[PDB]
């Protein structure tokens, strides 16, 4: 039994709201606790693939409190793993993305996509790799950051060394297929395809078929026979295809 | 994204620890407020149909807690119908069933029995009908206590007026299926159909065909003609099934 019907999503939320109330105490704390990990863990699982659960994060400050987190612990790379992670998941929601448009928050992740431990750049890439996305209209800062971190985008990941876990769980690759075509910004692309290839080679039991069962063959032999691409988006996604 | 496969199970027996906390925190402080009572409800439907919260709930002191939350807020009846509809959805799993087996904690349900309310009393009555239902062997505690709850379920039922609204939500009826072959312990069916009565009389558009669905006809109908029932048993098994019936 439960309390009256329609009832389980309040609840969720209210979870939600009492999580970033932890997060705000541990901060306050100066306290970088297990249970604070284990706190952000619980946020970032509850986002994703919620823009409702997203939405209440946005709308319960989260946005500002995280880059309080962000800035309290300056060298736990745990803990940047994980505020990015969620703030990867806010920003693969459309209608969030103008709440993301703000310049305290572009320039910390900015920062953090120079990080040179991809655990916490993939994460910083993610964010910047989907607000570019849409780009053009949507960009309501610099139009100069857009076009400079379109670039640095692109050069990170060139970068990185293959991980050692798995940095990273996706229960869909959906939210990645409409970066995929974005042929006029590579990075977006670029960011896509190392994402794809990266779970896949990893763990392919899972991912493998995933990719497949959800027409992402469709996209990648899109992005090869779409021969006026970016060369380094091109070696992956034809690296992906060879590979299936 | 997320952190990595199969971790929604430590994130969300996170969560009951840290909703526990917050129940112990607003009972330190005797503050009844909006959180305390969000947190109940939390708790009340997290353990719906989840033997995995349940047995966290109790491995975590859930059950000590919750006593002291029903001894420091003793007139609060939201509280308390919160607090037992929880401790309901644990009565209902029967691994959990000697966990339950604790005097002091069955003391207070029987308490709460008598309560003037029926949001409140109902759920007493359901932790109990659940309990008499393992049988008299898994029964732990005093046979004449074990006794005494049958015929004060039997006769509380009989007291109850119709509630205002719905007093609480299901997904399944299979929890009360066990429940309907206790010709035995009739007070034990009697809270079963009363309260699959209560919410077909209040919600028929989901019950009347969820009740349906899952087999709960021929349940009834082995009510109705099983000639050694206990009347009032009896009777609503038939009005059930006359409303169920359209």
Avoid at 200 to 206: I, Y
Wanted: glycine letters at 4%; proline letters at 4%; charged letters at 15%.
């Amino acid at each position: 039994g439960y309390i009256n019907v329609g009832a389980q999503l309040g609840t969720e939320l209210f979870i939600v709201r009492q999580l970033l109330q932890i997060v705000k105490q541990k901060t306050n704390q100066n306290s970088v606790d297990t249970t604070l990990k284990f706190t952000l863990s619980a946020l970032w699982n509850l986002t994703d693939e919620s823009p409702t659960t997203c939405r209440h994060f946005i709308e319960n400050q989260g946005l500002e409190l995280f880059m309080r987190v962000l800035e309290s612990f300056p060298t736990e790379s745990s803990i940047q793993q994980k505020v990015l992670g969620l703030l990867n998941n806010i920003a693969e929601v459309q209608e969030l993305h103008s709440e993301l448009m703000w310049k305290d928050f572009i320039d910390h992740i900015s920062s953090l996509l120079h990080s040179v431990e991809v655990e916490v750049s993939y994460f910083a890439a993610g964010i910047i790799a989907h607000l570019i996305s849409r780009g053009e209209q949507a960009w309501t800062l610099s139009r100069s950051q857009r076009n400079s971190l379109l670039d640095d985008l692109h050069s990170a990941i060139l970068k990185w060394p293959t991980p050692e876990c798995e940095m990273v769980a996706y229960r869909s690759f959906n939210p990645f297929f409409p970066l995929l075509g974005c042929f006029t910004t590579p990075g977006v692309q670029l960011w896509a395809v190392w994402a794809m290839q990266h779970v896949c080679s990893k763990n392919p039991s899972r991912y493998c078929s995933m990719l497949i069962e959800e027409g992402g063959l469709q996209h990648l032999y899109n992005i090869k026979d779409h021969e006026h691409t970016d060369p380094h988006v091109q070696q992956i996604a034809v690296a992906i295809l060879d590979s299936l």
